[PDB]
């Protein structure tokens, strides 16, 4: 039908190491929420890991968006892959979150992508994290649980999250989900595992604030994905960063192309429900006229026409990860050519070091110039990640736009 706004909207999602239980939790959240609010459509595991290649490889590959709501708020929830080969997808997902749920297996404790996901979430501006310690059904020893909680809290502190403060909820995504299948009307207070999910929803409700959002500034929506809807046309999805978009607005597709192009918005939807108007914070699909899915792509931004100029050259302040943080073992020189990640954008760039700076080492805080091989929507103060050869090598912030 149409999307009726009854309450504030917040974007959350799931991050964490491969197999720790992100997707099972996502499904469990929809089922638990749905028993109290009949507007929530339940999403089973297979409804989320739905792609043939996900079934083939047995992992999440694509970020999925699901919807649920509490009495307090409306949630769009982005479930991200944990597999180390799908970090780019995770980054694009995190780039949409006003808060993240970090899933950590109680049986394994924090693992390399537990660290990498916390790191990267920060670099795309995730303001808050809640921890769901999953698979406690597998762990009898209360000591290991306390140990895992401790390790996770410390790891959050390392990347400037308030680790000693974040909620750490302990439960079983799977056992809650099973209970909801046996009784879809299972209410709060009736089942131990389901109540742990309510504990999570409460923490989300109360710990992740509703962001301050500017609907008056020019429309800007980073594109997270693009697909063709049979009968309708090309849809670009994403979280509106600022401003508003109505059907009939001409917008500009900015970045990743030599030149910017204009198109008319012909539909706006949030979770397959038609919006009058999309506003900042909304996670929407925008139907674009006259463009195919080969003419719009993830990493471009939709913008008010003329409100944004894409850039290629910038100065940056960069931290280069130690190998103990999963970074490089050796240093690099000017001409180093990794991948840079800004919000949903990923693009190859060239490191150009100052005259006199010959080599940058793991663990260095440093400043240099970057030249991207394609123009990209950039702003001063925009954080970014650096990756190369399938690992994260650095964290940076844009300090000066040169060109
Ligand atoms: N014992 C137990 N197993 C669980 C629990 N939650 C999930 N699992 C199991 O853990 C495995 C991984 O689940 P999944 O939700 O796919 O994790 P994921 O983090 O989404 N994986 P990925 O990184 O690929 O997206 C599955 O076999 C699932 O049944 C739990 O609470 N307890
Ligand atoms: Mg998954
Ligand atoms: N998925």
From Swiss-Prot:
Q: Mainly resides where?
A: cytoplasm
Q: Where is this region: G4?
A: 134-137
Family of the protein in this entry: Belongs to the TRAFAC class translation factor GTPase superfamily. Classic translation factor GTPase family. EF-Tu/EF-1A subfamily.
Q: Region entry G2: which residue ranges?
A: 58-62
| Localization per record | Cytoplasm
Residue ranges of the region described as G3: 79-82
Known catalysed reaction(s)?
A: GTP + H2O = GDP + phosphate + H(+)
Q: Where is this region: G5?
A: 172-174
**Protein name (record):** Elongation factor Tu-A
Which UniProt key words apply to this protein? Cytoplasm, Elongation factor, GTP-binding, Hydrolase, Magnesium, Metal-binding, Nucleotide-binding, Phosphoprotein, Protein biosynthesis
One GO term describing the cellular component? cytosol
Q: Which sequence positions carry the modification called Phosphothreonine?
A: 392
Superkingdom classification of source: Bacteria
EC number per UniProt: 3.6.5.3
A single Gene Ontology MF term assigned here is: GTPase activity
Post-translational modification here is noted as: Phosphorylated on a threonine.
Per UniProt, residues of the tr-type G domain are 7-212
